[PDB]
Every structure is written in structure tokens, then in C-alpha cells.
Structure 1
Amino acid sequence: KTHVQLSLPVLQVRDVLVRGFGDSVEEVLSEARQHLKDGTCGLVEVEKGVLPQLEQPYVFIKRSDAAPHGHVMVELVAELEGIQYGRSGETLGVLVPHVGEIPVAYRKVLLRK
């Protein structure tokens, strides 16, 4: 399938134990994709103060289209020192490893795979 339906647990930035996927744009995009498959990927919503508390490179999910079955269509866009690798819509948040943190909510997304 080109698209996959996922329910991503939304985590509080201060609860997050592992604050990024790695050290290169190519690595964070690979680890992000792997965690999304193993269902070990969380989502932190981007506000004032949130990105400085997380490790670059960032991986964002951004809106790719305007929502089958309640699931918003999104795609992966890494960012490193102000440059993004990818081009897409509004940020739904930043992806992080999930290692058992209690979510505040769930975000239903359709991921281009």
C-alpha cells in the first residue's frame, strides 16, 4: 500500500525520554520510518519553547492534502539548522521515539509510504 493508517500517541515535550531519532537528516528520516512501522513513534505538537527542548535533526509530519476516515494525509519532512528536506503543508507536529510515555491524545494520520 502507498498509504498506511496510523494512530500516533501525542506526548508532552517534558515527558519525552528520547528526544530525536539520530544525528543526520538521512538517519532521522530512516529511524522515524522504522519506528512508525514498529508502532514505537510518538508525536509532539510544535509550540513556543518545544523545538529547543528536542534534538536536531527534527522529523515533522506535515499536511500533504485536505482526510479519509478521520485520518489526515501527511508526509515526513526532516529539518537541520533551518533547512528542510522535503516540501509540504502545515506541521501537525514533530516525531520522536515512543518508549512507554503516557499520551495526552491520539492523532489519526494517513502516511505516504
Structure 2
Amino acid sequence: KTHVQLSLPVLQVRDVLVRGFGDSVEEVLSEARQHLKDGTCGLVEVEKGVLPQLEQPYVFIKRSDAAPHGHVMVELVAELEGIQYGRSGETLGVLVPHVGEIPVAYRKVLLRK
């Protein structure tokens, strides 16, 4: 399928144990997509002070369109030293590995895969 319905656990930035997906734009997009397929991906909501507490390159989920079955359609955009790889809508949050942190909420998305 071109899209997959996922329910992403929303993590507090100070709880996150693994603060990025790797060391290059291509690796972080690869690892993010693998962790989304495996159900091991968390979401941190971006506010003042969040991104400096995480590791670059960043992987964002961005709104791809204006929401089937309650799931916002999203795609991945990576960022490294102020340059984005991908073009999309509003940021829903930054993706991180999930390794058992307790979430505060779930974000229902339809991921363009």
C-alpha cells in the first residue's frame, strides 16, 4: 500500500533515550521508515527548546494534504544544518526511536510509504 495507518506514541523530549536515527540525511530517513514499519517509532511535538535537545539530522512528519478515518496524511522530511530534504506541509513533530518510553498521547497518521 502507498499509505499505512499508524498510531504514533507522543514522547516528552526529556524522556527520549535514543535522540535520533543516525548520522546522515539518507540514514535517518531509512531508519525512520524502518522503525515506522516495525512499530518502534515515537513522535516528539516541536516547541521552543525541543530540537536542541535532539540529535541532527532530524526527521519530521509534515502534513501532506488537508484526514481519512481520523488519520492525518503525512510524509517524512529530514533536516541537517538548516537544510531540508523534502518539501511538505506543517510539522506534526520530530520522529525518534521508541524504546519503551511512556507516551503522553497518540497521534493517528496515514504515512505516505
User: How far apart are the structure 1 equivalents of 2:53 and 2:10?
Assistant: 16
Please provide the CA RMSD for this pair: 0.2
Query: What SS does the corresponding residue of 1:35 show, helix, strand or coil?
Result: helix
Runs ≥4 residues deviating over 6 A: none
Equivalent position SS for 1:92: strand
CA distance in 1, matches of 2:23, 2:31: 11
Alpha-carbon shift at residue 54 of structure 1 (Å):
0.1
Residue 100 of structure 1 aligns to a residue whose secondary structure is: coil
CA offsets 1:68-90 (integer angstroms, 9 cap, x no match): 00000000000000000000000
1:12-46 superposed Cα distances (whole Å, 9 cap, x missing partner): 00000000000000000000000001100000000
| TM superposition score normalised by structure 2 | 1.00
Report the alpha carbon displacement of residue 9 of structure 1 after superposing the two structures with TM: 0.1
- Write the distance in 2 (CA, Å) between the matches of 1:43 and 1:91: 11
Partner Cα distance (1:56, 1:99) in 2? 19
| Aligned pairs, number | 113
Q: Secondary structure at the match of 1:8?
A: strand
Counterpart mapping for 1:30-69 below 5 A: 30-69=30-69
Structure 1 gaps, min length 5: none
Partner SS for 1:32: helix
Secondary structure of 2:100 counterpart: coil
